[PDB]
Design brief:
This is part of a larger assembly, with chains A (188 residues), B (58 residues), C (260 residues) and D (140 residues).
Chain A: E1 36-37, E2 41-45, E3 53-59, E4 64-66, E5 71-73, E6 77-82, E7 100-103, H1 106-115, H2 125-131, H3 142-145, E8 155-157, H4 161-164, E9 169-171, H5 174-184
Parallel strand pairs in A: 1-3
Antiparallel strand pairs in A: 2-3, 4-5, 6-7, 7-8, 8-9
Chain B: H1 7-48, H2 50-56
Chain D: H1 41-44, E1 65-72, E2 78-89, E3 94-105, E4 117-122, E5 132-138
Antiparallel strand pairs in D: 1-2, 1-4, 2-3, 4-5
The chains are: A alpha+beta (188), B mainly alpha (58), C mainly beta (260), D mainly beta (140).
Chain A binds two RNA strands through strand 2, strand 4, strand 5 and helix 4.
Protein name (chain C): Small ribosomal subunit protein eS4A
GO molecular function, one term (chain C): rRNA binding
Domain S4 RNA-binding (chain C): 41-104
Chain lengths: 188, 58, 260, 140
RNA sequence: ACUGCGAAUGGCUCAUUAAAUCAGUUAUCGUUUAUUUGAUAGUUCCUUUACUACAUGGUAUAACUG
RNA sequence: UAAUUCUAGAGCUAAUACAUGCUUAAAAUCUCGACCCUUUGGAAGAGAUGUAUUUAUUAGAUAAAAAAUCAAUGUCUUCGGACUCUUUGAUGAUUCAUAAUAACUUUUCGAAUCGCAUGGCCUUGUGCUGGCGAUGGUUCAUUCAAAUUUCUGCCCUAUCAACUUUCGAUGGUAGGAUAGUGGCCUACCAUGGUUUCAACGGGUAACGGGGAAUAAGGGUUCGAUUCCGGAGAGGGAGCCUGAGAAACG
């Protein structure tokens, strides 16, 4: 199969090497799993030792994370816009690490009103007792709420789905978002 | 006859139940005494390092 | 190969066991256990090549199955169980108690001890770490882990272990001027005291040890086993007491002693 | 300049909170290498991002220590060191010269032109043919 | 006969292989590990004891008869 | 059925096989918040917390002294609020061990097993407790290991002087794959790397070392072969079961 030996390449000189042994099981590769979007299909493979890995063949949800507030909720994912390795994964919508997708913004907005009581865009006495407490921490960055009219955020993936099975990540913020948005609307 | 109730099977789940209660009781016993020793060892350490400051005052 | 190996040939067996090179073709191979392979001694080299009690392999298994032989207050029947340094071998139908400790020319010595010294065991300190749920432990040279120690213990110190409950009585630090046994290398089995210890960052540290007759030598740090303060060990030492005698000095000391 | 590559570049797991405000530039992270080596000035307050640097990246230094003269700087973030010795031939009672080239890695904290003489230490495999990177420098 | 463990050790030959093997020497802060030896587990009926067993739930097949 | 360690249909019953599934101390701390009528409020009730899996974000201190200050408070209230208040492992070196906060999961483990003995307590109910040890179990250490890797070292040959890079050759960035590092493979980019101190190619009736024969000293010639290391099972390639094999009874 796919082997990871260095005994088939050339030296730093250029001298062609020689066939030394047959191919050994403890240097093997497997097949690349491409991860589409759809209903949950996850298959399990058996590794060195008695361990276990979960290959994800297609999934549709995830578990994403708001950094600056420090809350991580479970949402759905929609589609990939940008991939820095080759752009044949954006035209097929696979799922790797460092892929930039769009999520639906609904449970973060529904959390935001519960935590503060202030809208996005445009009655027990316990509530305003503590809503008055969280007063100074109310406003956020302009350029991130400015997509809550459409419910499509920008988020990158930080979990390897072919190994761990899952697909999680984190929301783009303004320093990093300034880079990618200049990259997003100019390279097309 | 396999898989019937029997006095022989009866005390085995008694002894198994009696094990981990009598076992794990002793841990929080022995953990407190370890923190007891660490409690007093800090207490002199607040005092004994202040005596350098008594000498640093002199 | 493909898996582990399971035979030991006769000439590849460790030299200080003194198997004679014509009786067979393989040697006993020691099981996986507390002590390392080339630093230990199975229970068949003890009970038929040292004490001469048994005359076969079939006689040793007949001794072990009668549940006589213990190590450290625990019964063993593994016919190649690996007993190593500082282990206590308590037979019962003779009321003898042994302790494994080094000779001077580099061998494992037969040593009889009392019935009261056979209640405890030293052991050095190989690492000290913080375990799961925040408790600390300590690892000895034979592999015992012991949770909840004193904080003043550091690595390369020496603990004293009570073989009954598996617990600690007291401990000895590691600094200049202590009594030290040497458990590996060339000066193997000599006893002396610490002059000082220089340190190399990212390397192997060297101690300088003075004898009692005041002649000095140098070994690496890990072949050094603390025993006690000066003039006062914690164990019953063998004859000679770790004094290196030159070969000139031990011909005539055998000559004049030859009066029988 | 420091953002030329096609993906965003950062010392990972180093978070900037935009809600707070502090007049520092960015929370840079930096370590001490060991063995009595001194982290240079241009790494603690510099602005490069490099994955494979001893004072900033996630590599350790342990193993050997070598020394040699630099003979080619035509790659991007690697150089080539020449080392020279002698070799004894017992029948003829004499010596003969030999040499070996080693390639190492250069953090952008250092500025190395040809002809100098560096000291280098060993890290885990970095490329196909690379296992050292520079840790000190002295000029020509 | 099912289940568990072993069959990856041992024994034999020297065809390939010229910076490869292999020797003395380092490194793992770069990883997997049956076994052995020592530690290690009150929280898990929807529950804090409300229907629904813990004095203990359910099928399927081997050898065997024809 | 001529046949081989070939097997079909019908009928029974077990498990440490296969598939499920209960039990248990008290404490604390969080969020929600019925009410309450109020100042500077305090509250019933509710739920959440083992370990393992995946991601994000904090703690993981330490080089030498004293004020002015913005308020808040522990406290004698001196109703001024001045003060009469801190712990922190190891390494040459870490984003190390280890702990917390939000969560997440074709939800992992947390004894529906077996032999011996047979006692103590009673309201005497087959009531209640209770000895020695076999086998299984999650994670950290440990022992037997394994996989890669640093420095220097090989016989004859110029009638072999230039070799490697489409088809990865030398480096950079991001993914894939693996037990894991790495052009190991895939994308986009740079134009490198080896050489008269002999690269690259050709021969070997060449497995390498410990060692062996001869010996004034220096040396010349051997090592298929009792020990350790590698490779192979008619010649090439592929994979199943397993902790471990690209295995050839």
């Amino acid at each position: 199969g796919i082997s990871r030996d260095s005994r088939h390449k050339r030296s730093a000189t250029g001298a062609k090497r020689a066939q030394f042994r047959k191919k050994r099981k403890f240097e093997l590769g497997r097949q690349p799993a491409n991860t589409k979007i759809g209903a949950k299909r996850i298959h399990s493979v058996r590794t060195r030792g008695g361990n276990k890995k979960y290959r994800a063949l297609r999934i549709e949800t995830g578990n994403f994370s708001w950094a600056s507030e420090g809350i991580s909720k479970k949402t759905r994912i929609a589609g990939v816009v940008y991939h820095p390795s080759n752009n044949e994964l954006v035209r097929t919508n696979t799922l790797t690490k460092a892929a930039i997708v769009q999520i639906d913004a609904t449970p973060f907005r529904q959390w935001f009103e519960a935590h503060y009581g202030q809208t996005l865009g445009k009655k027990s006495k316990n509530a305003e007792r503590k809503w008055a407490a969280r007063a100074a921490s109310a406003k956020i960055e302009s350029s991130v709420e400015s997509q809550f009219s459409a419910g499509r955020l920008y988020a990158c993936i930080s979990s390897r789905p072919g190994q761990s099975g899952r697909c999680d990540g984190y929301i783009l913020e303004g320093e990093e978002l300034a880079f990618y948005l200049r990259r997003l609307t100019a390279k097309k | 006859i396999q898989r019937l109730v029997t006095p022989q099977r009866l005390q085995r789940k008694r002894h198994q139940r009696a094990l981990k209660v009598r076992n794990a009781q002793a841990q929080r016993e022995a953990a407190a005494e370890y923190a007891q020793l660490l409690a007093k060892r800090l207490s002199e350490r607040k005092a004994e390092k202040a005596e350098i400051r008594k000498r640093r005052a002199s | 190969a493909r898996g582990p190996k399971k035979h030991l040939k006769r000439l590849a067996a460790p030299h200080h066991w003194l198997l004679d090179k014509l009786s067979g073709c393989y040697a006993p191979r020691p099981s996986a256990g507390p002590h390392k392979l080339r630093e230990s001694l199975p229970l068949i080299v003890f009970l038929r090549n040292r004490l001469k009690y048994a005359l076969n392999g079939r006689e040793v298994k007949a001794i072990l199955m009668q549940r006589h032989v213990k190590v450290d207050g625990k019964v063993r029947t593994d016919t190649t169980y690996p007993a190593g340094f500082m282990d206590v071998i308590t037979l019962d139908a003779t009321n003898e108690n042994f302790r494994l400790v080094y000779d001077v020319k580099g061998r494992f010595a037969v040593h009889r001890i009392t019935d009261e010294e056979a209640s405890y065991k030293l052991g050095k300190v190989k690492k000290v770490q913080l375990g799961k749920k925040g408790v600390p432990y300590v690892v000895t040279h034979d592999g015992r882990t012991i949770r909840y120690p004193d904080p003043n213990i550091k690595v390369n110190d020496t603990v004293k272990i009570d073989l009954a409950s598996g617990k600690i009585t007291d401990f000895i630090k590691f600094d200049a001027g202590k009594l030290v046994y040497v458990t590996g290398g060339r000066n193997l089995g000599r006893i002396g005291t610490i002059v000082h210890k220089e340190r190399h960052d990212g390397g192997f540290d060297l101690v300088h040890i003075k004898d009692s007759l005041d002649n000095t030598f140098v070994t690496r740090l890990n072949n050094v086993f603390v025993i006690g303060e000066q003039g006062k060990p914690y164990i019953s030492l063998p004859k000679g007491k770790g004094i290196k005698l030159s070969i000139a000095e031990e011909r005539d000391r055998r000559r004049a002693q030859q009066g029988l | 300049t420091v953002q030329s590559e096609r993906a965003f570049q950062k010392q990972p797991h180093i978070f900037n909170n935009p809600k707070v405000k502090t007049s520092k530039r960015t929370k840079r992270w930096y370590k001490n290498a060991g063995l009595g080596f001194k982290t240079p000035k241009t790494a603690i307050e510099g602005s490069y991002i490099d994955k494979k640097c001893p004072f900033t990246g996630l590599v350790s230094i342990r193993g050997k220590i070598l020394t040699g003269t630099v003979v080619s700087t035509k790659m991007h973030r690697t150089i080539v060191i020449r080392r020279a010795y002698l070799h004894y031939i017992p029948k003829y009672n004499r010596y003969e010269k030999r040499h070996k080239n080693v390639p190492v890695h250069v953090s952008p904290a250092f500025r190395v032109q040809v002809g100098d003489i560096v000291t280098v230490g060993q890290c885990r495999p970095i490329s196909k043919t690379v296992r050292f990177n520079v840790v000190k420098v002295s000029a020509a």
